[PDB]
Amino acid sequence: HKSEVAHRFKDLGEENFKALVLIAFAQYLQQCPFEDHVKLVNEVTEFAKTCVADESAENCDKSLHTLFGDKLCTVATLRETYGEMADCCAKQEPERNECFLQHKDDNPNLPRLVRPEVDVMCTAFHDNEETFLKKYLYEIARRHPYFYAPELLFFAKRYKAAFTECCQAADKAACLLPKLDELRDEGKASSAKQRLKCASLQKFGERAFKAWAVARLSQRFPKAEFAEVSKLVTDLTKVHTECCHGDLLECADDRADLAKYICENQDSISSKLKECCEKPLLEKSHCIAEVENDEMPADLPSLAADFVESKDVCKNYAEAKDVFLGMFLYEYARRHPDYSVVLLLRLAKTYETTLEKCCAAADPHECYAKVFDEFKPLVEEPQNLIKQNCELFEQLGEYKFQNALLVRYTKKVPQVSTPTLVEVSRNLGKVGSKCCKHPEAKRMPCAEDYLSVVLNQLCVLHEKTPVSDRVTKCCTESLVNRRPCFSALEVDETYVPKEFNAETFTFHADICTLSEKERQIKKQTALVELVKHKPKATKEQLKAVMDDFAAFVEKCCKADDKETCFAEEGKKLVAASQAALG
Template sequence: MEGLPQKYNFSHCCRKGDFERRLCFFHNKKADIGFLPPLPTLDPEEKCQTYKNNRESFLNNYVYEVSRRNPFVFAPTLLTVAARFEEMTKTCCEEQEKANCFRTKAEPFIYYLKALSSYQKNACGALMKFGPQILQFINIAVLSQKFPKIEFKQLTSLLEDVSSKYDGCCEGDVVQCIRGRSKVMSHICSKQDSISSKIKDCCEKKIPERGECIIYSNKDDRPNDLSLREAKFIESDNVCEKRDADQANFMAEFLYEYSRRHPELSTPELLRIAKVYEDLLKECCNMENPPGCYRHAENRFNETTEKSLKIVQRECEHFQNLGKDDLKYHYLINLTKLAPQLSTEELTFLGKEMVIALTTCCTLSEEFACVDNLVDLVLGELCGINENRNINPAVDHCCKTNFAFRRSCFESLEADKTYVPPSTSQGLFTFHADLCQAHNEELQRKKDRFLVNLVKLKPELAGEELWSLLADFTNVVEKCCKAQEPEACFKEESSKLAAKSQAA
């Protein structure tokens, strides 16, 4: 279209053709959408009237607003969100307490959108950075845990459809993405007797709802005749010969067998164990007595899981010892020191996501898998999906070196030594009386932004000093909003706080 490629800096993509053009657009998507205001919320009465007057225009506008704020979400997910939004609008417009109805019903599907957005972004990031094999391994782990009675041959056939779905969805080919998703779900439903006992109701639904239902269905029960360990990968004398005959298929089958036996482990942990096993065989198969070497594989797997478990326990201790807000500040400080190049919006979002992960998981019986899965998605958000990213080289190294072990790589990272803070405070210590009008949620957002920008300005400050300056900011707001002349009070207190931060 005339003028558009120049306006949005896509001219170089338009000179390419087909697949390369789509990929070029994908790599140049704006991952950071901090320039957009929060999703506009209409007055409930106005919302209902607009829907009544022109249903199509109302829904199109909603899809537009949601899509541009979620640039990497797959099309079928957006269609489901739109359908749920319409359902909610119909129901709430009949209610007396419309505002309350919208608020209550919107929460679960906003959470659903964010959860699937993170998962899809993470999967596509893995595909873009590490290639199709890692995505294949992620899908093997997820599907084998969900459908433990599926035969390996049947899983391999299903994975072909799953892979072509991701190709379309991750490249941004909307039509192929929708068709691919439908094909995967039809494949599962046509063989449901040999795949899972938990999806009968899902398979009776219409196509868009069917997919969501299967994704969120419970894991099937483990078959009674499934032994706790698969001996052929550890006790057999000809493991090295089998591996050498077809390494990709051999490793895929190992991951399938291990995953279906361990529903309690997270996807990243299953990938770590597969990597440990692969490295162990490289070592053992060059020895004089390979079976004597790889018979100790279980010990290596247990050691790997122990290390991951300790990281999760440490994070859940933070959750137990700090309140919700302090937990968030802890992560905002750490994440900003790690990747100060990211926008304030992205960093505050990541801090909140860490808190959601821990508050969701740290009280559950399946704490380990839940925390490890969700925190891995936050790291996926931090690493980003496309190439259009400016980030600390050490973080970049963790993001690109090894997908399965990036969590432990991040554990050992320190603050970015290459970062040069801004030379001025850029209005950080300029406060006005409008802070007194901010509601709790808005004020909380401003506190989060203040802390992140403070760390960006003063990355060398220790945690205690940063916490102290944040407490001072809270006290200034409280004091000045009670003062007779709030604006004058803010002016005076702002300069005191600026001076204190300078001296720190």
């Protein structure tokens, strides 16, 4: 194509082109104000329009990396604000773009993004919708410089749909706020998952990444042959490697090529890709990534014929260990879409460890004939935990389920700071909301997906404030041992009770006014502090203090003199609670 900027403008359309140009510049120039970014986007959009009219016009034959880099180097505040980043401008392409990628800031130290009042947001959305939605993209993109720009554009369209529906409703806050909370959580999980996949690829290598992708793709495309799944794994691994390097254009072209290959070979891959493959270039790969699991070939043989009974089990294994183990993963995964990827990797690691020992023996068959008996306890351990926790979640609800988790894990790791225990237990309860709603066959893959971000948040929050050797041990374990290590945590019986502080257990009239989330956090902070002060208190002793606390809040938020009630009845509650647990 003669003018790459014109080709992108025509394939994306004016609306998507402007949104992606704003995201790209916001991610590199994180300190510049919104209005300066609007000026850069208008100048780039107009230049792209002169190139769609006449592809031979001045600068239209330049690469998009050259045009983008040229515009970054016209920024007045470049050396003053970004320092070393202005030195990238003295270099030629491709070294200039490589230099700019290295100087992106993962923590730009910007103020917390404050959600305004609902009436204020709806009035701004009505008066200048165009600016309101571009300010969303600007504020999110500048805070997440490595979030894949077209993925951030999908979240932006869901953000618009929440205001379009809820600002016309009778109760605007009751409609909009649960939608903005769900979107905030899903956006943060998406940002964490994108970073996690790159960190795993770098810290554990290409071999481990490929085994995960074989298991995940075999569950999604069970009718595809092993050779087809293996090729898609190699292509997907290359796409992730170049996407993790950080260049938006190399990443986007890589994803489009893979989506085009999948859409040409649909009969060899899946019967669920017809609608995805008709969608435009921007949506196509995103649609394929979230495609429904295709039905597995009806009438499949037992895994014993190829992996236990056959005479060539150890001959096939020695010939190419990774290929044979990948075939076991493919065969096991396509039959079990209900399993987590890590459970499938544990079964393949168990099967690998077995063949390493048994293939050296004189009669290998006699040594590994009972290998499938070892898989039963590994499969049932996460299945029973999900059933037990989902039946507890159904009985208590998200908030009371979060409270049961707070008491349990404060007793296990009481050295972890109260904000980290509150934050992680609240998110663990949110895992129960998003995954216990799905049926049995969809719960373990969902739980694995959200626990991977929740447990990584716990590990990142813990290493900056390291307090528990056991949390450090579970965080530095292999990926298949992380969750089982945390499940193995014992109650810290040698913890010395924290000294009592009256200010901690003092409540005020503001708890009556606070939002549901801010009110819950206050009570959950006090609950963790109560458990740290009295770690040996039983569930019946803590339940009495929690019921007495609830009745106290019930009474003082109805009283005429609320400030006097919270002060007088609160002194009695704290003293009676200390005596009950003394």
